[PDB]
Amino acid sequence: SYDRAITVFSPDGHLFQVEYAQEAVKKGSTAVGVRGKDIVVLGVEKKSVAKLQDERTVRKICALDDNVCMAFAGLTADARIVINRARVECQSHRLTVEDPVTVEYITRYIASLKQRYTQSNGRRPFGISALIVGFDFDGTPRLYQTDPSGTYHAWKANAIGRGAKSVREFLEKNYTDEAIETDDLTIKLVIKALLEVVQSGGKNIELAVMRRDQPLKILNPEEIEKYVAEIE
């Protein structure tokens, strides 16, 4: 077999491997999510269609459970491994506990894999960073992002991909107690967050929303143009 240490220390303690893994995260497509009151909204922008590529296989918005969904930005190959292994463990937790999976439980079940596989012998660090968003008991939403280094954090509003810092600048300034107060405000603020990274596309933007105990629902492109129709 192949047994060797891959990730090794440097004179400064930084890890060149992990740092290059985060560079591939920055070059991923822009994805964003925001915690509302009783709702959460995920969105991602895919501009690549000359009418050729099918829209069924492109979807980057995935659901870990009925109450937990996710979106990813990074290498699309590494995401398929993490999403599958997260769902296997997420349902294995429902095997151990009759109660559903709290969003914080599964986020530890995920970031820990990026911890092991980074420092494991012969393995490779993941080049993806994903937003795990869902609803805890009583209906309290939670939003968590992983790190190729294996760390995770809580966020009221967060974004990933190219220009992720630029989207946070609009979230940091425009997210107040007035924000995400009702359903109409949550939908507009997530769209308005994506309106700056728009590269002249009026449909390519994809959105999804989950409300309370209802399963994840995808908002069709025709209502996207209707909600983008009200801007000024």
Binding site: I6, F9, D12, G13, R108, N121, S149, A154, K156
Partner: protein
């Protein structure tokens, strides 16, 4: 590069172990204090943006009822040790039916520090050294005790110890504020004085976490209510 993790220096020291201690300077500052009335732990949440929730940040973890812990350095390596230290602590009570001495807590964790290698190992073998520094406080039959470990695995009984990026000037400041019989509440005051000086941000009630253990009270984390009463005494 052109060497293994086991390759010695011309001075005879492992490169991977040397760089492990050098990586702690990038971690979070936590200052433990050992007193006759208990052991005090304080750490900063290090919030770089209002969007984050302070509830998700726990830099002080509880190993046992009377035994606390502190955290710094690399976060990824610590969550593996915090769970492993807990299991061995319960394996003690599962075997001897007693509370593990904090010295034995430092002993069981120090065993897995230098186990790392490449050849002649199992699939459960670690490739890279731990980039985490730990502080074990607690009270036992010998009274309040505060211990420290490094990536090399050396554990030493300490009256006061500081970890993180600010440990350079904080450890020197602990020698000044610590004199003889100084109590827990007085150590809490001196803890906030040194911690406020070493941080770049402003000291707030919700900015830092404060937890103390006592001989007559179990390890307790001060909530937002009590934290407002503690910072008021400055």
């Amino acid at each position: 590069y052109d060497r293994g993790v086991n390759t010695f220096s011309p001075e005879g020291r492992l490169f991977q172990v040397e760089y492990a201690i050098e990586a702690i300077k990038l971690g979070s500052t936590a200052i433990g204090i050992q007193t006759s009335e208990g052991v005090c732990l304080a750490v900063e949440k290090r919030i770089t943006s209002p969007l984050m929730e302070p509830s998700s940040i726990e830099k002080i973890v509880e190993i046992d009822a009377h035994i606390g812990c502190a955290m710094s350095g690399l976060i990824a390596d610590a969550k593996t040790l915090i769970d492993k230290a807990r299991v061995e602590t319960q394996n003690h009570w599962f075997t001897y039916n007693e509370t593990m001495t904090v010295e034995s807590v430092t002993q069981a964790v120090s065993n897995l520090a230098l186990q790392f290698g490449e050849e002649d190992a199992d699939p459960g073998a670690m490739s890279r050294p731990f980039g985490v520094a730990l502080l074990f406080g607690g009270v036992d039959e010998k009274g309040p005790q505060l211990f420290h470990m490094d990536p090399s695995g050396t554990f030493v009984q300490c009256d006061a110890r500081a970890i993180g990026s600010a440990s350079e000037g904080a450890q020197s400041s602990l020698q000044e504020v610590y004199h003889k019989s100084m109590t827990l509440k007085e150590a809490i005051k001196s803890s906030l004085i040194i911690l406020k000086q070493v941080m770049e941000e402003k000291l707030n009630a919700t900015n830092i976490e404060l937890a103390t253990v006592q001989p007559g009270q179990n390890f307790h984390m001060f909530t937002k209510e009590e934290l407002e009463e503690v910072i008021k005494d400055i």
